[model samples]
Target: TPFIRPDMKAFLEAIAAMAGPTLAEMTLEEARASYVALHGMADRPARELAVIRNLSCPGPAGDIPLRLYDARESREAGPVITFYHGGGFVIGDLDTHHNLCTEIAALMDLPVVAVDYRLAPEHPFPAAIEDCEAATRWVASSPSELGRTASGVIPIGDSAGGNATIVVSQLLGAKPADVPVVLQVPIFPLASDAVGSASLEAFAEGFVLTKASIEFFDTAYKADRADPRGFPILGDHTAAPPTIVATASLDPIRDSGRDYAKALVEAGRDVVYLEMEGVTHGFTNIRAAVPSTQGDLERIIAAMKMMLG
Candidate 1:
C-alpha cells in the first residue's frame, strides 16, 4: 500500500479545487504559459544565496540562459553543480525554478549553474539535450567562471532535467582527470522507456504526473524511442558516471529510477538511491505545500555529501 502522509493528502485535496482544462486540452503555448502561471501562484520567497547572477552561453540552437547561484562558503576551488530544471521537456524556465535553484545552492553549499534549455513542440528533443550538453561543456571548459576546476563539475536535474542529466553524463565520457564529472544527480528522472512497471499504472493518475501527461511530454519532446540519449535505459550502462537517483514512492516514473540504480549497481558504478515515502511527483517543486518535503531534501543533501565526494 502507498504510505501517503497527512500533509500531502491534504495538499492534494486543496489542489483539487483548481478549475482548468487538462494539459492535453490546451495548445502548446497555452499549456506552457499555464504551467508557469500555476507555479507562480505557489511561488514562495526565494531563498538567500551568497551570489546570484544571470548570464548567457552559446547553445546548439542559440544563446542558452544560465542562472548562477553561489553559497557564502563556495569558493573558486570548490565544486560546481550544473543544474537542469524539470518540466517534462515541454515547459520550464529560469523563473519556474528560481527558488529551487537557490535552495539547492544553499543546501549543497556549492555553486549551481542552472541551464535554461529550449523546450519542445517547438525546439524538440535533441534540441534541449544538445543545448544542455553545450552549456555543460561551456562550464567545464571554463572553470574560472565557477571558481572550481572542470573535474569539480556535477550534473543535476529533475524529471526532464533529470533525463537530461543522465544523457549528458553519457555524452560526456572519459573526460580528462581535471574535467571529469564526479557524479550525476537526477531526481525522479524519466531514465527509461524500456519497460513499464507497476508504479506507472498504480500511481498513473491523480499523482500530479499522469501517464497521459508523460505521453504528451514525449510527443512534445519528439525524441525517438531508440535513441539512448532520449532513452538512457536502452543505452549502455557501463559508461554512466557514479550517480545518485532519487524518486518519489508515489510517482509514475519511480520504477524508472529504481531500474537505473539497479543497472548502475550491476555495472559496478557507485549509486545512491533515495525514495521519498508518502510523497508524489514534483515534491521538490512544491516543497512548501507539504512540510515533510524539507526532510526529503535533507536526505538528498546528506546523500550528495556522501556520494558527491
Candidate 2:
C-alpha cells in the first residue's frame, strides 16, 4: 500500500515521452520499430549485472533460438524462470528480453530460459502460441537437452509474454498433466480483444503502451481474434495452475488480467489477485530507469521465487 514494486505512473510518463507523440499514425512496421526503440533507450539498471547468451530449443516450428539467463544457481532445488517476452506477442524475442531474463536470473538466483516465439504476419495466433507451448513442453520433457534446471520450471513473461505464458500453460494442461504454478502480471491478459472495459477507457491514451501500440502488436500476433492462442483472456481455467495475477490499477488491460485471476479462484483454484496502486501497464521494463520500480519488480520476483521454490 505504501510503496509499489513499480511506479506505473512515472513509467507511463517516460514511455509516452520516448514513444514520441502518438503511435496511431505509425504503420505496423514503424510502430513495431518504435516499440523496439523504446526498450533500447532503457537498459538494465545494473549493466554489469546482465549477460546475453543464446541456445536452441526445439519448437513445433523447428529449431528455435532460446535466450537464457545464466546466473548463480544452487545445486539444490533451484527452479528455472521460463520467460516469453512482451512485444504484444509480435516483436519480442530472446534478445529483446535478455536483460529482463538476466535480472530475474541474477536477482533471484535462478536460471532464466526465455523463448524466442515465432512472430506474427509470418507466424500468427496459434503459431506463436503453439511454439511457446511446444517449447515449454519440450524443455520440461527434456531439460537436459537444453542445459537447464530440471527440478522446476517457472512460466513468466511481461505484457504479451505474460499473456502467452499462462495461455500456453492452460493449453498444455488440456492435453496432459505437466503444469507449473504460474505467476503472471496480467494473467488475465487480452492481447487482441476489442472489448472496451473500464480500464481501457481510463488509460486508452497518454500511457506509454497506448491502445494503438497494443492493437498494432495484437494485429501482428494473430490473424483473427477467435483463435484461443490469440486470445488467452478467454481461455478456460478449470484446471489452470495456482496463479498469482498482479495488475496495475491504471493500466488499460488491468481488469482483463484481474478478471482472469478471479475466474480461476471461482473455479476453486488457488489465486492471488493483487491490483497494484499508482502503477500502470508495462512498468516491468522500466525497472532499469526507476529505483522504486526496480524494488517493486524484485518484490514480485521474490513472490514468484517462493511460488516456484
Candidate 3:
C-alpha cells in the first residue's frame, strides 16, 4: 500500500456517505438519477468537442452506433479511443459519458468514439462483448469511414467498460496489435463474479460501489449466475497494452482489481497496477467534480501521453 492522499480520502468518504442511504434502497431509475446528481457535485468538464457525425457501422453482433468526437485543431495522433461508459453495465449511455469522453479526447489528444452496447435483462452473455469486439474491428478497419486519424485504434473503458476493453482486446488477440487497447480502470470489478478471489472480503456496505449495487447490475444482466454474458471477466485474455489498473482504497472492488492486475501480469501482459490509497471506486475521476479532487486524473493523463507517444 502507498501513502494515502488527504483529499482523495475525503472524497471517498463523501461519495459513500452521499450514496450510502439510497444505494440499496433505490430502484434502477432512482439509482441512475442519484448517480447523475452526484456528477453535478464534480467539476463540470468542458464540452467543447465537435461532433463530426453519428454513423452506424457493421459489428460482429450487429451494426453498432457510435458518437464521434473530433480533435480541436489538427490531427497528430494515432489510435482513437473507442470508449465505453461505466454504469456497472446496466446504466450509462454516450450522453452519460459525454463530458468524460471530451476530456479524454482533449487531454489525450486523440479521437474518442463511444459505444452504446446492449444492456442486460435484454441482451446477455457475450452479446455486449461481441458488440464491443465488432465495434473495435469496425473502428480499426473502417478508420476512413469512422473519420479517425487513419493510423491505428485502441479501446478504452472504465468500470464495466474497462472489462469490455480487456475482453474485446483479448478476443481479438495479437493480430490487432496495431490498435492496442488501454484502460483507465478504477477497480477490476466482477471478481466475486467469475473469478473467485479472496478480495471479496474487502466488501464494505456503505463504501463506494456496494454489494447491493453489484446485485442490481447482475440481476438486470443475468437471471442465472452461470450465464456467460453476465460475467465478461470470465472470458479469456491475451497479451495487451500496459493497462493502467487503478484502485481506490475504500472501493469494494479494491482487492478484485488488484487480483486481476496480478493475473494480467501472470499472463505476461504489460500491466501497471496503481493502488490509489485512501480513495474509493470513483475517486480517480473525483477531480471531475472538484478541482480539489487532486492530481490523479493528471497522473493518468501524463501516463497516457507517454504511452501513446
Quantify all predictions' global Cα lDDT against the true fold: 0.82, 0.65, 0.63
Residue 113's lDDT in candidate 1: 92
Displacement of residue 306 (Cα, Å) in model 1 is 1.1
- Per-residue lDDT for 107-138 in model 2, tens only? 77766677888887677777777777777776
- lDDT (Cα, tens digit) per residue for candidate 1, span 1-309: 678999888877766666456678898778888767756655455788778988878876678889888876446555578989898889889988888888888888887899999888788878888888888888877645554455466899989999999988888873433476888899999888724688999987777777878888887888888898898887778867778999999999899988889989989888999999999888776777676887887788889998865
Candidate 3 achieves a global lDDT of 0.63
lDDT of 3 by residue, 1-309 (tens): 434466655655676565455444777677777766665456456558655457777766667888788755446546777877677777766666666777777777678788888766467656666677777777766456765554566677777776676666666664563455554332344532522434344554554566767767766765344543344445454555566676666666666677677777777876667765555566534565445434666666676666666
Candidate 1 local accuracy as lDDT?
0.82
Identify the leading candidate in terms of TM-score: 1
Ranking by TM-score: 1, 2, 3
Name the runs in model 2 displaced over 4 angstroms: 1-24, 27-29, 46-52, 73-78, 177-188, 191-194
Q: Which candidate ranks first by lDDT, i.e. highest? A: 1
* Model 3 per-residue lDDT at 244: 67
TM-score list, all predictions: 0.93, 0.85, 0.82
TM-score pick, better of 1 and 3: 1
- Model 1: CA > 4 A from native: 143-149, 174-178
Task: Write out the backbone clash pairs for model 1.
Answer: 76-147
